[PDB]
Each structure stands twice: as C-alpha cells, then as structure tokens.
Coordinates of C-alpha atoms and ligand atoms in Angstrom, one line a residue:
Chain A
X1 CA 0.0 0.0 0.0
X2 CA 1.1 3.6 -1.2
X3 CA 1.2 5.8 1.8
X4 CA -0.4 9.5 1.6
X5 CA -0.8 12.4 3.9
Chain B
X1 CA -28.3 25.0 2.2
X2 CA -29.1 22.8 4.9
X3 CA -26.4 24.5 7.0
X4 CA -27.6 28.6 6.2
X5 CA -29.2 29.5 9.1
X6 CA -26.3 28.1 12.0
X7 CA -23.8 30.7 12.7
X8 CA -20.2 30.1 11.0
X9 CA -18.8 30.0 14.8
X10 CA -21.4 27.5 15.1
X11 CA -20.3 25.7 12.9
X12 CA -16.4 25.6 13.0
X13 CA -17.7 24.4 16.8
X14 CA -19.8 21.6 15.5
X15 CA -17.1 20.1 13.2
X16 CA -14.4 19.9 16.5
X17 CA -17.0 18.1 18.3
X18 CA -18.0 15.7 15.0
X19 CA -14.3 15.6 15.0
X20 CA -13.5 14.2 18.6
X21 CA -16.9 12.0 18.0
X22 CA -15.1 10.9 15.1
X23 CA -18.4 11.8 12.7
X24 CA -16.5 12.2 10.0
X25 CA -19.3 12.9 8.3
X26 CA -21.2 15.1 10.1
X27 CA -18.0 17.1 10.0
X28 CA -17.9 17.6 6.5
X29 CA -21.2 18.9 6.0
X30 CA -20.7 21.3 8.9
X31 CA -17.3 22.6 7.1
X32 CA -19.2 23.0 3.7
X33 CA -21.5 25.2 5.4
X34 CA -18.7 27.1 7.1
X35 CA -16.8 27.7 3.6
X36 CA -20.5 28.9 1.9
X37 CA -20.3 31.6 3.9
X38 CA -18.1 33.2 1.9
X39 CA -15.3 34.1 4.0
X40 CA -11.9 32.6 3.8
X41 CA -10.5 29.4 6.1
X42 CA -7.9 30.0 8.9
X43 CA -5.0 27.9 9.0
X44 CA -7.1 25.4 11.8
X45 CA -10.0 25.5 10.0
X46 CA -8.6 24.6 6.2
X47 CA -7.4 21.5 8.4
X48 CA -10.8 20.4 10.2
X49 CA -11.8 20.9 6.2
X50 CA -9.2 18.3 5.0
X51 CA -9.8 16.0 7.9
X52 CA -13.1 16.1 7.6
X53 CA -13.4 14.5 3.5
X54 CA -10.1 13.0 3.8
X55 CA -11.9 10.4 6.2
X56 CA -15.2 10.2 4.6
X57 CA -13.8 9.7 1.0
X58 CA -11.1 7.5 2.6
X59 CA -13.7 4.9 4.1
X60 CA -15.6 4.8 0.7
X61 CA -12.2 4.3 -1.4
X62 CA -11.2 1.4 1.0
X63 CA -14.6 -0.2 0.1
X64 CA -14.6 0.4 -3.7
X65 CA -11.5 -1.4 -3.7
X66 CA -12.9 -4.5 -1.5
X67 CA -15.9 -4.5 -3.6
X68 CA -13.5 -4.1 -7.3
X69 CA -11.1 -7.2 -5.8
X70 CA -14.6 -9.2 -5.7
X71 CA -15.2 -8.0 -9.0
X72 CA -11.8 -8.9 -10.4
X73 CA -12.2 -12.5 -9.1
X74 CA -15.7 -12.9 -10.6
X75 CA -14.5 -12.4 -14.2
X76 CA -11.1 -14.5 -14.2
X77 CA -13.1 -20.6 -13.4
X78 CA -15.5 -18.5 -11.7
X79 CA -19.6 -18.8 -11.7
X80 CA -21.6 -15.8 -13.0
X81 CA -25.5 -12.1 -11.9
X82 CA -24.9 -8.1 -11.7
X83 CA -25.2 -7.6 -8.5
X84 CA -21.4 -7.5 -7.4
X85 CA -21.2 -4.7 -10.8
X86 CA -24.3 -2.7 -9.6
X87 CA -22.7 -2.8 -5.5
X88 CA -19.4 -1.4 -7.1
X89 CA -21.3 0.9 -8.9
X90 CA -23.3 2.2 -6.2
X91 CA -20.1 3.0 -4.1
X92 CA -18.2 4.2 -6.6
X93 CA -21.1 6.6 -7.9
X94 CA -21.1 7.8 -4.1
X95 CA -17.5 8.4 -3.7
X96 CA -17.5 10.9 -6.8
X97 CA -20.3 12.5 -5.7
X98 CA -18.1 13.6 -2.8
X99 CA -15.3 14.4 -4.9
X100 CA -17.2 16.3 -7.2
X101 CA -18.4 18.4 -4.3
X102 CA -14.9 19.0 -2.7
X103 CA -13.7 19.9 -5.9
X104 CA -16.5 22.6 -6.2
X105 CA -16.1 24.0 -3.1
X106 CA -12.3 24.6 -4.3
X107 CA -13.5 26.0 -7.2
X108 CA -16.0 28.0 -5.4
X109 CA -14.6 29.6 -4.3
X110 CA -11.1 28.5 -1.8
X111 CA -8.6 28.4 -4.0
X112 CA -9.5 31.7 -6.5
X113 CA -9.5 33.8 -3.3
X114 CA -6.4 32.2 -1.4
X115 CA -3.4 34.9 -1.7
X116 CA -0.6 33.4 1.2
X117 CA 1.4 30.9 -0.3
X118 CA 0.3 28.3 2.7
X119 CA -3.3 28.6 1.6
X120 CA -3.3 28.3 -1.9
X121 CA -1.1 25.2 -1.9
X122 CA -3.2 23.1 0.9
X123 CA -6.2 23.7 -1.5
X124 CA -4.2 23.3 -4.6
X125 CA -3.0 19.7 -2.9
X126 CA -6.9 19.0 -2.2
X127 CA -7.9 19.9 -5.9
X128 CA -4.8 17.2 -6.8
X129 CA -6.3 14.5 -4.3
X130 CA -9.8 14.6 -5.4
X131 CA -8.8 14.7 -9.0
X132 CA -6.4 11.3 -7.9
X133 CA -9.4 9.6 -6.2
X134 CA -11.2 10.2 -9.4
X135 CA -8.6 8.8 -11.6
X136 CA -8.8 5.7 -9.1
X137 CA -12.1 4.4 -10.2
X138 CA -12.0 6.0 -14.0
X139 CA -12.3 3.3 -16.9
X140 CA -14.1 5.5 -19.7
X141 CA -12.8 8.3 -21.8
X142 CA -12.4 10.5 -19.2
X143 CA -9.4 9.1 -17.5
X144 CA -7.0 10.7 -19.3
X145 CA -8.2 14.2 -18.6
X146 CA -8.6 13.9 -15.0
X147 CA -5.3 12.6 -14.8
X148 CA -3.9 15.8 -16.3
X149 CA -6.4 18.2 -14.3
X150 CA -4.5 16.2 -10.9
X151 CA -1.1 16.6 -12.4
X152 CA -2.0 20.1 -13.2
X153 CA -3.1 20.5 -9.9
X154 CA -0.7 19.0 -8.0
X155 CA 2.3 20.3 -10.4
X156 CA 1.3 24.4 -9.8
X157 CA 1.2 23.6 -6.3
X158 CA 4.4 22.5 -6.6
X159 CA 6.0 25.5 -8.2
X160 CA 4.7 27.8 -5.2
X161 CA 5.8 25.7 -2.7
X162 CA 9.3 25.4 -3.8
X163 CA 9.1 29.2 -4.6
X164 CA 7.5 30.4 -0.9
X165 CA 8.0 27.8 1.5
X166 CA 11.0 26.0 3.2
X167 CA 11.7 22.2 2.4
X168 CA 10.7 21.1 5.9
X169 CA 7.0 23.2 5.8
X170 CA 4.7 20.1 6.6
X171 CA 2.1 21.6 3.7
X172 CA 5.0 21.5 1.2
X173 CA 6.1 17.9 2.3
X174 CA 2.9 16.6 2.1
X175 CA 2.0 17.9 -1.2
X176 CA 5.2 16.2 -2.3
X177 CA 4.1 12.8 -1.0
X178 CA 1.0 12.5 -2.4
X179 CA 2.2 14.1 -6.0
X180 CA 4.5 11.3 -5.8
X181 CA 2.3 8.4 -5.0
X182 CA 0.2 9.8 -7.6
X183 CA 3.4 9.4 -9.7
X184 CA 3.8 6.0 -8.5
X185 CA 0.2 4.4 -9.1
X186 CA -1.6 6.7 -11.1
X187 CA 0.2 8.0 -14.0
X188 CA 2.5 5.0 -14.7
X189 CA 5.7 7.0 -13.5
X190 CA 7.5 4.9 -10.9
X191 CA 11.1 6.5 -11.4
X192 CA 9.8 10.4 -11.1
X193 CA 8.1 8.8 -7.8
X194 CA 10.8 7.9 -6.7
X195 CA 13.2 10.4 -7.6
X196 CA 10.7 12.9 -6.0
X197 CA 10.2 11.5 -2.7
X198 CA 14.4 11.1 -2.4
X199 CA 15.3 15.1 -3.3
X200 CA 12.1 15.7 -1.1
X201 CA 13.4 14.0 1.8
X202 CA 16.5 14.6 1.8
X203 CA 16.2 18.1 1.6
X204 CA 14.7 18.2 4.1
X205 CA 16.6 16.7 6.4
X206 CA 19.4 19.3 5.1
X207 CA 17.0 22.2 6.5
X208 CA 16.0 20.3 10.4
X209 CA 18.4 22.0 12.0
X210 CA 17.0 25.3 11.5
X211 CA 13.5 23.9 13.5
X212 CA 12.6 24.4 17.3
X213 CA 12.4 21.5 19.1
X214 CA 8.8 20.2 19.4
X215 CA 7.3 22.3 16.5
X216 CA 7.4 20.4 13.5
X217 CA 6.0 16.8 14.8
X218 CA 4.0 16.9 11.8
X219 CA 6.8 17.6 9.3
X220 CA 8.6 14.5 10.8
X221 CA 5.6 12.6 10.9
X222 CA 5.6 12.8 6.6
X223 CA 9.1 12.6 6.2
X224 CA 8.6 9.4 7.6
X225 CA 5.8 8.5 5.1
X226 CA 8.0 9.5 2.4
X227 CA 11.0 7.2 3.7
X228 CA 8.3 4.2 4.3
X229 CA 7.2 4.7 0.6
X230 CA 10.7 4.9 -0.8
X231 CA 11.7 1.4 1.5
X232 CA 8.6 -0.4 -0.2
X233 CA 9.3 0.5 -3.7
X234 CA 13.0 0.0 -3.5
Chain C
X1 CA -39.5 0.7 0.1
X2 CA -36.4 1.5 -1.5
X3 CA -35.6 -1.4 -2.0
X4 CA -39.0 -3.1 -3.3
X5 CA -37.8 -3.6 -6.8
X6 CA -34.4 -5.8 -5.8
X7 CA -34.9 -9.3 -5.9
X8 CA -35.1 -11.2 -2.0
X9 CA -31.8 -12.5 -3.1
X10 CA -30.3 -10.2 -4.6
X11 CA -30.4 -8.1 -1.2
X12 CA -28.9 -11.1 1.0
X13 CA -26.5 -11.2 -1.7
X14 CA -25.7 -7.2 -1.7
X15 CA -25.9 -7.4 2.1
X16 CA -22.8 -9.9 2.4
X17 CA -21.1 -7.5 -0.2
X18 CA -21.6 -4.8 2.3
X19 CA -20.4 -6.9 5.4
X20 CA -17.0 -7.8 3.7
X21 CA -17.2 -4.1 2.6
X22 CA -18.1 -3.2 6.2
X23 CA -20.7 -1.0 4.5
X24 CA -22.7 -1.7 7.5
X25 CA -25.5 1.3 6.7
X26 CA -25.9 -0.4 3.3
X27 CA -25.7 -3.5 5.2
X28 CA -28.8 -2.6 7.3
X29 CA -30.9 -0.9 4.3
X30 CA -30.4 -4.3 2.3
X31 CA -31.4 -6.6 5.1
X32 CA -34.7 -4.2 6.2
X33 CA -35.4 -4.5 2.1
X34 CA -35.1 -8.5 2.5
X35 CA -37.4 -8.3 5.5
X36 CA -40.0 -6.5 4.3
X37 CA -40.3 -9.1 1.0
X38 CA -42.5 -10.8 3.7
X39 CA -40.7 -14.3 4.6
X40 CA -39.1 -15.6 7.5
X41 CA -35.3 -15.1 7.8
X42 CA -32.8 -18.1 7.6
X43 CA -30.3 -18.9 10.7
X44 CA -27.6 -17.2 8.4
X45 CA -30.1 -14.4 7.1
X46 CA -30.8 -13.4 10.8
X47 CA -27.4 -13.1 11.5
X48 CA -26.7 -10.6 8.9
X49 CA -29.8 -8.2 10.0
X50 CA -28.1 -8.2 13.8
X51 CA -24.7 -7.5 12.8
X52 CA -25.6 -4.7 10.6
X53 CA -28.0 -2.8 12.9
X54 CA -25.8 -3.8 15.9
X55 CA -22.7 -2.1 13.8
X56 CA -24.7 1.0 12.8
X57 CA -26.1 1.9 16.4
X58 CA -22.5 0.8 17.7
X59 CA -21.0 3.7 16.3
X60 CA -24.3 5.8 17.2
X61 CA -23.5 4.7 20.9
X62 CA -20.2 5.3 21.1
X63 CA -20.6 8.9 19.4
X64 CA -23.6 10.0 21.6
X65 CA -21.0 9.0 24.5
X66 CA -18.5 11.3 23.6
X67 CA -20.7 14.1 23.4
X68 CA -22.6 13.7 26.5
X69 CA -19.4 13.6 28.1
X70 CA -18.7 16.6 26.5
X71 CA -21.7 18.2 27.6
X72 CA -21.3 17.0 31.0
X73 CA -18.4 18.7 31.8
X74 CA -19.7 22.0 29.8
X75 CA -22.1 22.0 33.1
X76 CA -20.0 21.9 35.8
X77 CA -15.6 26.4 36.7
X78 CA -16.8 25.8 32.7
X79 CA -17.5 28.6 30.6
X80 CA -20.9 28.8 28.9
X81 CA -23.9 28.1 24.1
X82 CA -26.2 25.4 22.6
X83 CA -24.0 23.8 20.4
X84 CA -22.8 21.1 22.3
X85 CA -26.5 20.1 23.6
X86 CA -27.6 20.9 19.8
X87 CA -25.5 18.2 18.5
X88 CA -26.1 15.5 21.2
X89 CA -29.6 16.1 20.3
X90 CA -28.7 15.6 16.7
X91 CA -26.8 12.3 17.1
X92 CA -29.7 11.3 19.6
X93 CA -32.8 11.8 17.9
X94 CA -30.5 9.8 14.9
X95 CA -29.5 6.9 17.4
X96 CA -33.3 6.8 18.6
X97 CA -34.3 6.3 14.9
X98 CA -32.3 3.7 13.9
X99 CA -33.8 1.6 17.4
X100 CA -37.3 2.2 16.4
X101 CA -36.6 1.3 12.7
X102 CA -35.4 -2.4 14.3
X103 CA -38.1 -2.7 16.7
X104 CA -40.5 -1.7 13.9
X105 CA -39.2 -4.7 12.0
X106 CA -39.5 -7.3 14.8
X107 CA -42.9 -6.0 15.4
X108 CA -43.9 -6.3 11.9
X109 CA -43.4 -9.2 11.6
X110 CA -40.1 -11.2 12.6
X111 CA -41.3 -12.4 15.8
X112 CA -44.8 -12.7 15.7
X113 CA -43.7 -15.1 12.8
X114 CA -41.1 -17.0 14.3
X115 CA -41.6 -20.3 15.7
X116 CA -38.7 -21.9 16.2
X117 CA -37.1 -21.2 19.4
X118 CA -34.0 -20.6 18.3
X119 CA -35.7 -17.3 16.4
X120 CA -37.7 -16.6 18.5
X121 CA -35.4 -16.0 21.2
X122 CA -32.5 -14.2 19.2
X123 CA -35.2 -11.5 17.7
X124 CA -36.3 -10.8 21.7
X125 CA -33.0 -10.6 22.1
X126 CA -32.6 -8.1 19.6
X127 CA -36.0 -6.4 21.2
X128 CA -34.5 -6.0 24.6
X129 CA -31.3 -4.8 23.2
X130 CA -32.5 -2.0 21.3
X131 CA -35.1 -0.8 24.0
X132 CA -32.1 -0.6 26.4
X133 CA -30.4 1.4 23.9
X134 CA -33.3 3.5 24.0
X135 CA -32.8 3.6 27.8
X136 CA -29.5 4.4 27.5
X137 CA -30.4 8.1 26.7
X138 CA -33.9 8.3 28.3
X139 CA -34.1 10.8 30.5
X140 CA -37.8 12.0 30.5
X141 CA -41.0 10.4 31.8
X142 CA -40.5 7.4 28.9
X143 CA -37.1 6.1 30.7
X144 CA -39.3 3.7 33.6
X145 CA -41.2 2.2 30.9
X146 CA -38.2 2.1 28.1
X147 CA -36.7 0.4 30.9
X148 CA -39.8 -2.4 31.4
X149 CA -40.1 -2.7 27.8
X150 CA -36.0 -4.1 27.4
X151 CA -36.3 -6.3 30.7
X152 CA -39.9 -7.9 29.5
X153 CA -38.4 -8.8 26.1
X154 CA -34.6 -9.9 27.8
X155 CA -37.2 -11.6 30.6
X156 CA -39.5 -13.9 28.1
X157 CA -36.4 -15.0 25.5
X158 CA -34.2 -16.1 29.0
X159 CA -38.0 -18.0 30.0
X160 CA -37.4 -19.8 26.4
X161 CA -34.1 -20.3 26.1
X162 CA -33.9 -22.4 29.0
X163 CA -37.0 -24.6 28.2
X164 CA -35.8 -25.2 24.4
X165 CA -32.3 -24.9 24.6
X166 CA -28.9 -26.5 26.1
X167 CA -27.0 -24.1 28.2
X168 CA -23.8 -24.0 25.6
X169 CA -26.1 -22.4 22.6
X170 CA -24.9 -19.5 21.9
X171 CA -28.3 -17.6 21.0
X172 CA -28.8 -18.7 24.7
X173 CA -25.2 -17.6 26.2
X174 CA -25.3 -14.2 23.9
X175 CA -28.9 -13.1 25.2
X176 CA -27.3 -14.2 29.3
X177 CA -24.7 -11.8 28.6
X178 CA -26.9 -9.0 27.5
X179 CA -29.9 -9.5 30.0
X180 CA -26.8 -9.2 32.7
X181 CA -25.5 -6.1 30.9
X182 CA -28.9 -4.6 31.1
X183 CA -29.2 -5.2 35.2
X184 CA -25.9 -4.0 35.5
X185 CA -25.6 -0.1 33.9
X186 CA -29.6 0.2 33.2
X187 CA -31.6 -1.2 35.9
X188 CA -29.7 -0.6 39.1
X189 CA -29.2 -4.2 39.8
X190 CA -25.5 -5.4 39.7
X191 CA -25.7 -8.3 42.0
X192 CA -28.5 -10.0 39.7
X193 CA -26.3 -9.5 36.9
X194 CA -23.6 -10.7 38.9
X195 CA -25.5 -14.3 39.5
X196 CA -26.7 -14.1 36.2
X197 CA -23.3 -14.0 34.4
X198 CA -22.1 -16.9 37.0
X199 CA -24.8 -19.3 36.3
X200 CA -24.7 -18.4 33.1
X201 CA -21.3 -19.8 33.1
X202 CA -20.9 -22.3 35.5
X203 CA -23.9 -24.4 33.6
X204 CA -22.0 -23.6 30.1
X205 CA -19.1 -25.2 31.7
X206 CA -20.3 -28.2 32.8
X207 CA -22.3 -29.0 29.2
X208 CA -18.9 -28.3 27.5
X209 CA -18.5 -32.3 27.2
X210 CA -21.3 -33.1 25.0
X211 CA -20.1 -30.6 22.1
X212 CA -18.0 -31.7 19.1
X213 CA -14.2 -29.8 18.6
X214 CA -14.3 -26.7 16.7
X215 CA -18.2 -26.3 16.6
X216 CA -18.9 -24.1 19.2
X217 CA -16.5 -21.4 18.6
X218 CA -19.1 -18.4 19.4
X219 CA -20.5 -20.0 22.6
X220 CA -16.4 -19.7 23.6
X221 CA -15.8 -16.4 22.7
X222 CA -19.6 -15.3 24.6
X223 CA -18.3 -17.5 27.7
X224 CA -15.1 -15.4 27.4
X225 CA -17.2 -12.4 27.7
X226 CA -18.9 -13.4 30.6
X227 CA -15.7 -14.1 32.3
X228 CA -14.5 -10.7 31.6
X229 CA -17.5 -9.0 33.0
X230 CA -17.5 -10.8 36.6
X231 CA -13.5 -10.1 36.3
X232 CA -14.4 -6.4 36.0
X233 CA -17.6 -6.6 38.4
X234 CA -16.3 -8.5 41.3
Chain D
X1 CA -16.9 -0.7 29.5
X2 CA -19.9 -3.4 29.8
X3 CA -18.9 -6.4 27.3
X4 CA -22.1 -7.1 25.0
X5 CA -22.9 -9.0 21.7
Ligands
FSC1 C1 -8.4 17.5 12.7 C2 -7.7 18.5 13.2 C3 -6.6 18.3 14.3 C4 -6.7 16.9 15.0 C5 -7.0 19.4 15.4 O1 -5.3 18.6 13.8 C6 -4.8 17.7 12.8 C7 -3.4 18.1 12.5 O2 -3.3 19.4 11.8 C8 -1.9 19.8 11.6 O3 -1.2 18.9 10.9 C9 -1.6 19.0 9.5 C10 -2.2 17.6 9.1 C11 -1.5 16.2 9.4 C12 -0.2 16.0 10.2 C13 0.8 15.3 9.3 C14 -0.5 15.3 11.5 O4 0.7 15.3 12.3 C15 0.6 14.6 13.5 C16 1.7 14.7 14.5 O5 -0.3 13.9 13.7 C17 -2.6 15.2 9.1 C18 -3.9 16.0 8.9 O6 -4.6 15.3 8.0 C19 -3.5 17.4 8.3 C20 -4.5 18.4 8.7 C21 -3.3 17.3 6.8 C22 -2.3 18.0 6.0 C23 -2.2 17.9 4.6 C24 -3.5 18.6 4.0 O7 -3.4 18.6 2.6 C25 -4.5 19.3 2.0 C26 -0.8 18.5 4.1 C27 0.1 18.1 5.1 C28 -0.8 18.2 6.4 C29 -0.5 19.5 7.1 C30 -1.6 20.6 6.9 C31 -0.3 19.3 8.7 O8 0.2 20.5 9.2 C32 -1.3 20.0 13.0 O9 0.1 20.5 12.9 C33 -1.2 18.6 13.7 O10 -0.7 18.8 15.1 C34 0.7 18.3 15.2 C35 1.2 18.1 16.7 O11 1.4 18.2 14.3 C36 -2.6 18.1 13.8 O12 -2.5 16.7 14.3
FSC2 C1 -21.9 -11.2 9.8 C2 -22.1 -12.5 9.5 C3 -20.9 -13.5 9.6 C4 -19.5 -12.8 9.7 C5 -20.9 -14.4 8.4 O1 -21.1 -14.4 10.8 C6 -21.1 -13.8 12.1 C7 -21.1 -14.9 13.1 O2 -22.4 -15.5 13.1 C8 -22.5 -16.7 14.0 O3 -22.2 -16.3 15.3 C9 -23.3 -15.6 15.9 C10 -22.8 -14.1 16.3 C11 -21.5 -13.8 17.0 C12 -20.5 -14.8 17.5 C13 -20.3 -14.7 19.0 C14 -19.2 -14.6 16.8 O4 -18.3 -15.7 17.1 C15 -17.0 -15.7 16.5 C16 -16.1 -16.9 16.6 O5 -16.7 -14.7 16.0 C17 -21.3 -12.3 16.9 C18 -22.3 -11.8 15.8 O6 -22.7 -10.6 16.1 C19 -23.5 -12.8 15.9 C20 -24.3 -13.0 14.6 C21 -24.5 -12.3 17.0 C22 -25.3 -13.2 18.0 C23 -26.1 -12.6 18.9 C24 -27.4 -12.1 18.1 O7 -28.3 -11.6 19.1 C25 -29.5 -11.1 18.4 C26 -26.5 -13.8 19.9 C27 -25.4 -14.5 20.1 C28 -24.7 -14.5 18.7 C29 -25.0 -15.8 17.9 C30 -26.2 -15.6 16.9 C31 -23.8 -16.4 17.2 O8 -24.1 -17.7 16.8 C32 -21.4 -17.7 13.6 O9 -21.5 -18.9 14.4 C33 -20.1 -17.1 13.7 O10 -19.1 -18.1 13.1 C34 -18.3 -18.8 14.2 C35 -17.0 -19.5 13.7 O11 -18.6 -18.8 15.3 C36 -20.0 -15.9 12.8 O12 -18.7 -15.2 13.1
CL3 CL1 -5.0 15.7 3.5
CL4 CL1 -26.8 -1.8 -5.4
CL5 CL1 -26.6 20.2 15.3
CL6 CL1 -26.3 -9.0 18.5
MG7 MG1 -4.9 7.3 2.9
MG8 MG1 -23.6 35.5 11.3
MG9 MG1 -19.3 4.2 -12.8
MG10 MG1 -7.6 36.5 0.3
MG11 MG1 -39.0 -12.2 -6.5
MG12 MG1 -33.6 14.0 22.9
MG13 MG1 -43.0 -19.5 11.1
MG14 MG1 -20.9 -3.4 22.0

C-alpha cells in the first residue's frame, strides 16, 4: 500500500 | 443550504465536536456550510476541512476497492449475476459525488480567493487529491483528462511551494508525497516517484536543523511516510 | 420501500457485499429490504440483519458518548452556548431512529412469525437490546417504561431459552450476557447481573462435554465475555 | 466498558 498524507 | 441558518462559529464548533466523536461525516457537511459563507478558512479551520473528507472519502475508497477485488475475481473458473457490478457501482457513484463536491467548493470559491502561499497550496494539494481519487475508479474516456487536471493541480502547487516555502513546511512535504504516489500508481511514473520523494526527503533533512524543538512533529511525521514509501518500492 | 424492486436474493447477496465491505449502513438498508419481501429469515439471514444494525447503532452509541461527556463537563468552573447540547440532540434523535426502525421490524413481523425457538429467542434478544439502547439516553417520563419494555423482552427470551435450549447455545449464552448487561448499567441491579453471568457460566461449563471440537467457537468467545465482566464486576 | 454482543 502507497502511503499519503 | 441545509447549514444557512447556523452561525459560522457555530459551525467551526460543530465540526471539533463531530471531530473528537469521530463523525466524520457530520464534520464535513458542517465545514461546507462554514466555507459557503463566503469568507476565507484560517489555518485550523482549512485543516478540520481536509480532515473532515479526507476520512469520509477514505472509508468509501477502502470499500470500492474491497468490492472491485470481488469483482476482479468474478470475471477470471469462476460462476456468473450483476449484483457484485451494480454494489461497485453504487459505491463508486457515491464516492464521486463527494469528490465532485470537494472539488467545487475549491473551485468555489477556496482556491481563486487564497493569496498566502500556505493557503493556496493546501487547496491546490486537495484539488490534486480529489482529481487522484477520481482517476482511481476512472475506466471510460475520461481518465486521461482527469489525470492531467490532478497533475496540473498537484504540479502548480508545486512551483509555489518550492518558490515560498522552506523544504521542511509540513504543507509543502505533504503535497510532495502524495504528488508522488500519484506518480507512483496513477500515471505509470514509478522512477519520477521515486526520484521525488528522495530530493524531497533529503532536503529536508538538510533544512532540520533550523527547526525548534517540538514544533514540526507533523513535518517528521511525513518525512517518515516519504521514507516508508521509498523502502517499499525499493 | 427502497428497496422493493431488488430481488429477495439479490439483497442477502448485496448485504454480504456490504459486510465484507463493512458498509454496514448499506448492510442494514439491504437486510430491512429482505425483511419487508414478507418471509421468515434463515439462521444465516438473521445473523446478517443483527450484525448490521448492531454495527450502525454501535457507532451511534459510542458517538452520543462522547458528546454527553462533553456536555457533562460544559455544566459543571466551565464557561458557557447550545452547540454542544444541539448536536447530542442531533446524534440522539438519529440513534433513537435507527432503534425504532429495528423494533419496527420485529414487530412487523419477525417475531410474531417465528416459531422456532432458536428465532424466537434471538429477535427478543434483539427487542430488549434496542429498548435498552433506548434507555440508555432516556431521560424524560418514557425512561421507567423504556426500561420495562428491554427487561420484559430480555425476561420472556431467557423463559425460552432455558426450556428449548442446552446451556452452551450461543443464541442462549449471547442473550445471558446482555440481560446481565442490562441489570448491571440500566436497571440498578449489579448483583442479579452478577448471578446471572455466573450461572450463566458455571452451567456452560459443565455441558462443554457433550459438544464436538471446533463447533462451538461463538459460545467460547460469549463464555469469554462473561468471564471478563464478573472479572471487571467482582 | 460493559462487554455485549
Ligand atoms: C483534525 C484536526 C486536528 C486533529 C486538530 O489537527 C490535525 C493536525 O493538523 C496539523 O497537521 C496537518 C495535518 C496532518 C499532520 C501530518 C499530522 O501530524 C501529526 C503529529 O499527527 C494530518 C492531517 O490530515 C493534516 C490536517 C493534513 C495536511 C495535509 C493537508 O493537505 C491538504 C498536508 C500536510 C498536512 C499539514 C496541513 C499538517 O500541518 C497539526 O500540525 C497537527 O498537530 C501536530 C502536533 O502536528 C494536527 O494533528
Ligand atoms: C456477519 C455474519 C458472519 C461474519 C458471516 O457471521 C457472524 C457470526 O455468526 C455466528 O455467530 C453468531 C454471532 C456472533 C459470535 C459470538 C461470533 O463468534 C465468533 C467466533 O466470532 C457475533 C455476531 O454478532 C452474531 C451474529 C451475533 C449473535 C447474537 C445475536 O443476538 C441477536 C447472539 C449470540 C450470537 C450468535 C447468533 C452467534 O451464533 C457464527 O456462528 C459465527 O461463526 C463462528 C466461527 O462462530 C460468525 O462469526
Ligand atoms: Cl489531506
Ligand atoms: Cl446496489
Ligand atoms: Cl446540530
Ligand atoms: Cl447482536
Ligand atoms: Mg490514505
Ligand atoms: Mg452570522
Ligand atoms: Mg461508474
Ligand atoms: Mg484572500
Ligand atoms: Mg421475487
Ligand atoms: Mg432527545
Ligand atoms: Mg413461522
Ligand atoms: Mg458493543
């Protein structure tokens, strides 16, 4: 899973 | 507007209690009120804004993708009806209905009246996220444009951050993490993902020691995203 | 009726969907659509109209909490307006909906319907459960007889349970644990919940020998529960 | 917290 803020 | 006749102070006080009640979305309809009317966000409130349809579209993306997976599997040695398609539809048709609203708020009217630098790139990051969600789910003809409205998005905020704001500002560091995992699963560009989140780390890191102790838990809190994202796709 | 033009199966089927989604709104809306097609519920069918409701007032519950406790400290050295009691009210009159929605249902017409005691008992289970969450945030002249209304549901399910049931089932154990629940933190009565849970256990225990390995996996976990509550009670 | 289910 791609991490985002 | 359901929300025209409760005070804005109402308001911004009614999405801090949705917030610690976790009502995530009770908080976002009491922020949309707040920003129709017609005055601009402070710094806290742009963030109870973000919070707010961060977590409501983040629940329905994590159930699109649930429902897709089941999809997937149903077309590979697998039995046939529509109901799993007409499910995914039904979520999916609900998730950009709250991106389309996000993004008109945005348009309507955040980001044309935003003058500090801080401002204009938190909404210019949103108006990249929503776009990015909406690339997600796209299949038709259209996913080639909203790809480029994210990009185009994401990309101006860009250029103001790295012309206004120091490499450790949390706003700026965030905006780069999420332009590059839009990079990364979106628009097929794995080595410009990667390549941002390095230069974005790393100068930042350069720039720490210029930071008061205790003031920029947030900033270390994405660096750390950016270095998690970099160990999984290297 | 919403859903009146979806097939009976095609809402059990949506309904799972949801579950593995934990789209548990959905989840609810497809099961009350299945209901109201006029037919008695499965074992398995049953089981997906309590989690759902159960799931949806859950997070009512633990919302409403937060807020009163909020508003309880906003009355005692605490500044002053309405908006905290505005929103309690909000989430309230929502969480009150939701309870007479599922009462609605097993009065028309899940357990007049039922025959079986294994139904019979779980939907007075479900009866008693949402009354007492009802009672929960009574506070008016309606909270005594909220109150009667959970115990005489909890009272004639325990009356059947242990006529038509062994003392491992875990319709039976699950509806112990609740009824004790409810004399514990609703009706002012800890020590009968206190005897209730032991008994409740105690004659689990000893019927343990006459179940097969691996089948009774819920009436564990419900024992466990009961455990956990004496632990935390005596 | 009261344990139901
Ligand atoms: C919901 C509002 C509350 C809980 C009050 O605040 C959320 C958070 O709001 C601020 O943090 C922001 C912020 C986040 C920080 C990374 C959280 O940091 C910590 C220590 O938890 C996550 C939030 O989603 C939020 C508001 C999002 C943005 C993001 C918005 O893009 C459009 C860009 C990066 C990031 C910026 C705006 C952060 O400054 C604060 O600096 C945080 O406080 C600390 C100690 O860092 C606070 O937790
Ligand atoms: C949502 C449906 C799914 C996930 C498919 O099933 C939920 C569960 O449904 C069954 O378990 C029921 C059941 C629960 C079990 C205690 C769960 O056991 C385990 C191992 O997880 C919790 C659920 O909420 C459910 C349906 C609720 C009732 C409760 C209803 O009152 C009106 C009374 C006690 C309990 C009974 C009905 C249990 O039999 C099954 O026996 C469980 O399977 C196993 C291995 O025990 C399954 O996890
Ligand atoms: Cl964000
Ligand atoms: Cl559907
Ligand atoms: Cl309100
Ligand atoms: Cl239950
Ligand atoms: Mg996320
Ligand atoms: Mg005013
Ligand atoms: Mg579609
Ligand atoms: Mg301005
Ligand atoms: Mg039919
Ligand atoms: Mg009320
Ligand atoms: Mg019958
Ligand atoms: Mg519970």
């Amino acid at each position: 899973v791609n991490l985002s803020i | 507007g359901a929300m025209g006749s409760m005070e804005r102070a109402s308001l911004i006080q009614k999405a801090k209690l949705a917030e610690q009640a976790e009502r995530y979305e009770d908080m976002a309809a009491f922020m949309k009120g707040a920003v129709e009317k017609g005055e601009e966000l402070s710094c806290e409130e742009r963030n109870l804004l973000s919070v707010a349809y961060k977590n409501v579209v983040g629940g329905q993306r994590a159930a699109w993708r649930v429902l897709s997976s089941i999809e997937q599997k149903s077309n590979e040695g697998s039995e046939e009806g529509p109901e799993v398609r007409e499910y995914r539809e039904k979520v999916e048709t609900e998730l950009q209905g709250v991106c389309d609203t996000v993004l008109g708020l945005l348009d309507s009217h955040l980001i044309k009246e935003a003058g500090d630098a801080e401002s204009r790139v938190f909404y210019l990051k949103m108006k990249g996220d929503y776009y990015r969600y909406l690339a997600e789910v796209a299949t038709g003809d259209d996913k080639k444009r909203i790809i480029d409205s994210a990009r185009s998005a994401y990309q101006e905020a860009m250029d103001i951050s790295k012309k206004e704001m120091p490499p450790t500002n949390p706003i700026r560091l965030g905006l780069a993490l999420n332009f590059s995992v839009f990079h990364y699963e979106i628009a097929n560009s794995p080595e410009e993902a990667i390549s941002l989140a390095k230069t974005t780390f790393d100068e930042a890191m350069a720039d720490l020691h210029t930071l008061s102790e205790d003031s920029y838990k947030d900033s270390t809190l994405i660096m750390q995203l950016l270095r998690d994202n970099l160990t999984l796709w290297t």
